């Protein structure tokens, strides 16, 4: 046979990110001495849109702590942030929308976004538009904090990790039907070469395990083992169950 | 259609002259020669084409210096008094 | 067209100078074997492509 498309995508080539129009990575400030001991105050200068991203980005200007110059930061903007607003980041920052505080200083039951999984990572959780995390509890003896993630799972992180107060802007995006093939074309133009999609049963046996036959059909079960080699692991990978879900929907993911 | 009509669609050129070997074998996009592998330091040489080796070996050119040094060796590096 | 590297222009110049017939007094030499240039080139028959 020949190589399957899912395996071919791993070489890179014509399947990489279209990033020419993007403004750069979005991240928090660097966890420095001022952030660890006091606070820093910056000003929001502009709010902008980036190709391929549903949330708005904010440019925030700070003063350099050691030299005579200005520093510009690009961050994911929570809903309600406006130009001219003051942003406080550090240990002694007050509790308000847009500020960045250590998790140990945030009251239980609060809504946060742009959460650091590890201290100094500059934000890796709850970044897509309309998403957020919920603080559950603190453990002062262990120095840890419990969080509920957008997926519904629960995670424990060190209390030194930082977070921003509020929810990510741009929520409600997926409620509007697309209605046209051209709209999907423009939607994926800013992201990558992954559209349109061709069904596996519409291909030939040389290219896909589902191809061939005098009827369009899969001749074997479409649930495949976790141990299947690349080129064979297509379909429903290591599925615990199939079919329409009756009753409550369980939380997805590993134990 | 393939054939006569498509022959008129061929524009530009893949290869140009090579600075090192002089053949029309220098790939413009990749910036390397298909005949002598310039700008690699060493040249192409393959034993599956001995006929091609005989076309490029020593003695197929001028040998401006080799002729002189061959004479000096044969005369044991003679010098005057 | 108008554009060409100077090295390319010099190669074309040499080919122009070589496109000449044999001088007549060559045929009168002792032991001569040459009658025509036998390497004459015409722009419509064979292309140089450089």
């Amino acid at each position: 046979g020949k190589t399957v498309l899912s395996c071919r995508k791993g070489n890179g080539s014509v399947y990489q990110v279209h990033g020419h129009k993007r403004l750069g990575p979005a991240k928090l400030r660097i966890l420095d001495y001022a952030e660890r001991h006091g606070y820093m105050r910056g000003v929001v200068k502009s709010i902008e849109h980036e190709a391929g991203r549903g949330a708005a980005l904010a440019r925030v200007e700070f003063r350099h702590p050691y030299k005579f110059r200005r520093v510009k930061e690009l961050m994911v903007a929570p809903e309600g942030m406006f130009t001219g607003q003051s942003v406080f980041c550090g240990q002694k920052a007050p509790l308000a929308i847009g500020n960045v505080l250590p998790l140990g200083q945030i009251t239980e039951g609060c809504i946060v976004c742009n959460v650091e999984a590890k201290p100094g990572d500059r934000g890796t959780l709850a970044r897509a538009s309309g998403d957020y995390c919920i603080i559950i509890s603190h453990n002062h003896e262990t120095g840890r904090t419990r969080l509920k993630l957008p997926s519904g799972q629960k995670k424990s992180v060190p209390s030194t990790s930082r977070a921003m107060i509020g929810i990510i802007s741009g929520g409600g995006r997926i409620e509007k039907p697309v209605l046209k093939a051209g709209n999907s074309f423009y939607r994926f133009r800013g992201k990558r070469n992954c559209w349109p999609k061709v069904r596996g049963v519409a291909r030939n046996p040389v290219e896909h395990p589902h191809g061939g036959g005098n009827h369009q059909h899969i001749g074997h079960p479409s649930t495949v083992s976790r141990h299947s080699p690349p080129g064979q692991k297509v379909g429903l990978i290591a599925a615990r169950r199939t079919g329409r879900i009756r009753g409550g929907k369980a939380v997805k993911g590993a134990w | 259609t393939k054939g006569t009509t498509s022959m008129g669609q061929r524009h530009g050129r893949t290869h140009i002259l090579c600075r090192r070997c002089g053949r029309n074998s220098y790939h413009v996009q990749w910036e390397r020669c298909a005949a002598c592998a310039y700008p690699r330091a060493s040249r192409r040489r393959y034993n599956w084409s001995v006929k091609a080796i005989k076309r490029r070996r020593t003695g197929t050119g001028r040998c401006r210096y080799l002729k002189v040094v061959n004479r000096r060796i044969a005369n044991h590096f003679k010098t005057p008094k | 067209g108008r554009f060409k590297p100077l090295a390319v222009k010099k190669k074309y110049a040499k080919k122009m100078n070589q496109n000449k017939p044999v001088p007549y007094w060559i045929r009168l030499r002792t032991g001569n074997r040459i009658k025509w240039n036998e390497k004459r080139r015409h722009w419509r028959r064979t292309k140089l492509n450089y």
Binding site: - | - | L6, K9, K10, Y12, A13, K14, M16, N17
Partner: protein, 47 residues
């Protein structure tokens, strides 16, 4: 070319235009100053 003209024929050139011929040689049109006569210089050379 301006300097060589002064050193060889003791004339002053006010303008030099050059071109490379299709046969590979280089040709120069050299205009002499009004103090000299090109025809007189040509006779001395031997044209």
């Amino acid at each position: 070319i301006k300097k060589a003209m002064r050193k060889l024929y003791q004339v002053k050139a006010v303008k030099v235009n050059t071109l490379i011929r299709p046969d590979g040689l280089k040709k120069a049109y050299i205009r002499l100053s009004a103090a000299h006569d090109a025809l007189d210089t040509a006779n001395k050379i031997g044209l």
